[PDB]
Swiss-Prot record, chain B:
One Gene Ontology molecular-function label: transferase activity, transferring alkyl or aryl (other than methyl) groups
Catalytic activity, EC: 2.5.1.153
Catalyzed reaction equations: tuberculosinyl diphosphate + adenosine + H(+) = 1-tuberculosinyladenosine + diphosphate; tuberculosinyl diphosphate + H2O = tuberculosinol + diphosphate; tuberculosinyl diphosphate + H2O = (13R)-edaxadiene + diphosphate; tuberculosinyl diphosphate + H2O = (13S)-edaxadiene + diphosphate
Required cofactor names: Mg(2+)
Keyword terms: Transferase
UniProt name for this protein: Tuberculosinyl adenosine transferase
Functional description taken from the UniProt entry: Tuberculosinyl transferase that catalyzes the condensation of adenosine and tuberculosinyl diphosphate (TbPP) to generate 1-tuberculosinyladenosine (1-TbAd), which acts as an antiacid that directly protects M.tuberculosis from acid pH and physically remodels M.tuberculosis phagolysosomes. In addition, acts as a phosphatase that catalyzes the diphosphate-removal from TbPP to produce both tuberculosinol (TOH) and isotuberculosinol (iso-TOH).
Keyword Transferase in record: yes
Keyword Cytoplasm: no
Assigned protein family: Belongs to the diterpene synthase family.
Amino acid sequence: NLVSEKEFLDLPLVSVAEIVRCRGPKVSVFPFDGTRRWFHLECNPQYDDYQQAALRQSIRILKMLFEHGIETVISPIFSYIVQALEGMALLANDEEILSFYKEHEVHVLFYGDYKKRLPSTAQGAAVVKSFDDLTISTSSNTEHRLCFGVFGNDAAESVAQFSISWNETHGKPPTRREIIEGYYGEYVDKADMFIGFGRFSTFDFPLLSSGKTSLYFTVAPSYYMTETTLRRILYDHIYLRHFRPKPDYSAMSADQLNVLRNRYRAQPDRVFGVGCVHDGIWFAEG
Amino acid sequence: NLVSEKEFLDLPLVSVAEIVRCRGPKVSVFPFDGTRRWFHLECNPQYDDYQQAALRQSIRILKMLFEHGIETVISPIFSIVQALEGMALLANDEEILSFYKEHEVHVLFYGDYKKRLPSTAQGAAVVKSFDDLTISTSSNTEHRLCFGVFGNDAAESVAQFSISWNETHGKPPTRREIIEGYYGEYVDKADMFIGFGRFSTFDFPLLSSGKTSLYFTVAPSYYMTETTLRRILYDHIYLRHFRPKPDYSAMSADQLNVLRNRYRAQPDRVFGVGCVHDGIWFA
Ligand SMILES: [Mg+2]
Ligand SMILES: [Mg+2]
Ligand SMILES: [Mg+2]
Ligand SMILES: [Mg+2]
């Protein structure tokens, strides 16, 4: 599929979705991060509704990922709380997002230790109940999958308990496939990519990470994400992360090898991830 | 406790090791990547031995990591006959053994090698070597070195371990018990992962966290210098958790238009999106 970045970017949406459904990413993890900084810069914190402002951008981006062919999107939403709980509730009660789930035929699942960790209060109990009801009401949807992580960072103990019960009722240990399904609600393949923000770090997609998960870190908060940016990330994943023919130094020009060698020996301390702080804000050097 | 990067780079090693032992990283993951590219560029493929050349560099780096104050280093080594020759050297080579002793390193192995390695003699040998090396260095307690062999996905390992554990205890194991079970000894979550080239991470199951500082060098692992390592540590220790934390709520209007234009002018700046030059991916 000999294609240039610019060309990929100029391609019509439905053509990108098609490529994506053939070459992946099939599963993308995308935590909406830096929302606080985003709000203060792109909104009016004096009057604007933080909750709704955020919700709107979440829908816009989730829509964009799905229209580009991505089957499953994993999104950690919670890794003060009254407003943290109100935001979660909006994900299962807001009419605009519910319309979005229906229109795009999205099956919404939740993962994490939220049944235990959420406050044992009226507000906490409602959120938990809202989650279960949403998974049930959107269960007829089969076009896309959306997994929201709430306390979904350390699955060890959850997998241990799930496994013990499983073996008890089946007489044998669950396969990796069954374990994934037990934790997320449905089988999901290993993440093909994770789109982070700022400081290089990833989180909350337990059991789904592999050496094959392409990692990206945006400079600007997640809500600045545009279609062009997503397509540049997609192009890198599809055409560059596993570029073929694979390198065969054994047959590279002596001149090309020399430049390469000089580059490494001159900048042996060039490391992406090493940043600098300006006014309290961390910036990746490059 | 207020040191610029330039100052940190000029500190005596002993002072750096004292800062690391106090502020971390305590657990560092560092797979030695791009060694074949490194071998082709820095050695004479015609006469230098790949295994030896690589082992020397591996020893050199581990030494650097441990002398800088890092307590535990997790190093994924594999995930074919020559692959075993390299493993063999880890628990047999005269100089690396002297290393484990000199720097008092306790060596452990993790992953599903006991069931994935070739069901042969040479393979059965490796397994025994691993078990013996862990025993022979069990008195050392200054540093820990965990070698990952087929240590990519612990899902089924944890399931079977938990089911057996419930049978031998009548209770499910705690996270701590699961970690001890997979790695042999309890190990804290990784504080940093030092990668290479295309941004990706791997082989340190159950120990990743949002607090794990991720880094990706441009050049193969073996080009690492003391300066490179210190720049990673500095960033991790002083910048990744810098304080005071941002207060946009009280920032200057001028500064807001700065961050604002930066983010609006360059909407698509994404570290990880690279380019391939002559078949080589560059960030
Ligand atoms: Mg992020
Ligand atoms: Mg980050
Ligand atoms: Mg690496
Ligand atoms: Mg890599």
